[PDB]
Amino acid sequence: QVRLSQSGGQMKKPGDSMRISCRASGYEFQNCPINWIRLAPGKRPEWMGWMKPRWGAVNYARQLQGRVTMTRDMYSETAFLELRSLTSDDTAVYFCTRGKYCTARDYYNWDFEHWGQGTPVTVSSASTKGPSVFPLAPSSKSTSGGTAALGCLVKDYFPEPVTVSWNSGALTSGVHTFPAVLQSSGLYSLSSVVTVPSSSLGTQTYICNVNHKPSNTKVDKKVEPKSC
């Protein structure tokens, strides 16, 4: 039974180098190429290169040239991956793989039947940034006979996560807090909204409570109709 077993997950900073291992068993190690594939949610699977254990011959993905190194230890049947000059873009789960077809005389590399369990690597700054909190105001006139939408825009924080409650948790009905999006700046943003009776806008107070544990930030923001 063919098995690939990988080393444990890691937290890294921008500029660091990383090394991960993949121990093979169940077959003749030097007969088949080992590949490294990394997965990040929202991105295509990325082949990083292959390594043939016989002589340690390698083929690195062009876009990773000069940054990656692949070696092996023949006795322990272990393949090794090194990636230098890490940035945010290197955050991913790293896999070692082997083709399905492999004999002593022949192989086909690319049908990846065999995968290691994966090695999660996170690359991020130690810095934290608290959110800006802006009101998403109800509307203009109080349309008594309908429902109004209001909320808070929680912008430019790092890292995840932030949580949002309304009126210290007393208001839950009709509340939608959306999953955050990652902006171009590298900072996160999200919104939380709630639908309420329009006739309550001049009576009940609506306050969103934003919590951001990494920056030790707790912000309350009253969302009221714009006066004009």
Add this chain to the structure above:
Amino acid sequence: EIVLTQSPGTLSLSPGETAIISCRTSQYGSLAWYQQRPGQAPRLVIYSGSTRAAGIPDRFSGSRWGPDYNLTISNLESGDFGVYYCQQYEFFGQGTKVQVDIKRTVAAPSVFIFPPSDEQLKSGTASVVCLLNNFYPREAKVQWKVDNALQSGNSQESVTEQDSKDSTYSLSSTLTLSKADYEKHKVYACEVTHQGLSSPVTKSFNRGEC
């Protein structure tokens, strides 16, 4: 350089239904399909276009028409849901997320648009938010128009999980401009198309006036 174009990005289906995932290639050759369940390593489903890997039931079948390879998954079970990838040599498609959807009657979204707050405008940037509330099915399109000109590359969307109670979805779309660009234009409109609407619905506001 092989270009693999996978579609659609997301399938929202119920158990027992069929998933149809397609991959368009720029080059003929051995194409494989992989399945990744949440928190698990990817798994080889199909190789050489239509050959089932070991342990894969015949509910999974691969086909090819011209440069279009298709993975079809009939009678969806719980273990079938996850993200699927096509592959040729070292190249992979973008992936297709197949997620569980609970069926209910069609419901049009309630649409709201939010102008930038005066507090944010003091910071030099302007965020315009459009909310699509409590709709079904999940498939919806949002387009931003600024003075009747279509916007591209300056908006981001986010969708909630299907609600446990009413089985609906909600969507937020944020248009982000510099303060300078924002004060350059008047009409800020966001246009929603959805099966629950007879016609695309547009919510808009004019800058400055309340």
Add this chain to the structure above:
Amino acid sequence: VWKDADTTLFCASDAKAHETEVHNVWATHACVPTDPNPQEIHLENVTENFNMWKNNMVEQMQEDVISLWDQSLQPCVKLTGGSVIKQACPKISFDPIPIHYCTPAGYVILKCNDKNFNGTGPCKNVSSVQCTHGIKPVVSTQLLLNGSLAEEEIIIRSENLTNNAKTIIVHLNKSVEINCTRPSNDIRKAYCEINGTKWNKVLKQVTEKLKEHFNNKTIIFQPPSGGDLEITMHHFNCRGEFFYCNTTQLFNNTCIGTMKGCNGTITLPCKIKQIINMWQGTGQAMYAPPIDGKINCVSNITGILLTRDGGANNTSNETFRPGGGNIKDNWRSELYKYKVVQIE
């Protein structure tokens, strides 16, 4: 009527019974004398398919050469499989001789004679022979030495060019001498000499030929990305000594395009190593220090082993690096035009 088949071949040679040279001795007992009058029958109106990458003649030759090396180039110390083996390791007489491979009764070798045949697919002009030509079992990496030349154009050979894991064999139509020497009076230091005028013109033709296979992309050469010394350097055996030669200068992109200054003699730095990784497939081997006096071997560069860089980039260029390590490919480069068939 015949069909493609595999069998146990026998070998033939012109080995000398008086010779103490290692290849001669092996061939004396393993092979029979060659045929004075070989018979070749050209098959008219016959079209056959070939596949040099799935030719089991290669497997048998591989076994023979391993057997030759195991029984002749014995190390002082053999480090393999956690164990240590200490043997006697006298200096030997070493110089490869041509080995013919032949079919027994009931079997015949088919030979493709198409001048531009790339190794796979149909061949229009097929002949029928009992034995292959004389193939020297030369073990090397990066450069194929002392082999046969392509008849017409330079020929690119690969099981699948679009597959970056498959080896590429460049078959030259013009030999380029490589003159390697370890002088008399560091004893391990050596060097190879190559005429850069001859080499760069050939290399330019190689890039042009490669352009035809890769949609007129810019063709770029680079040194090996990594691996053991046996493949990151030009590795070969001369007079019993294991040579390792740095081929960085051999693949100069400057000289194959502003093309002024590199018009002369190229000198590759070499080192004779006593501790080597065995190609036979095991581990490490230890040999005695090199023999005294002038160690020299003048070879024909007749082929190049390449690997092409993979990756989801988007540039209009392909990168190629000196390859090798799979010695079976060396035999494939000479056995490509042959296949065994069984008569009825």
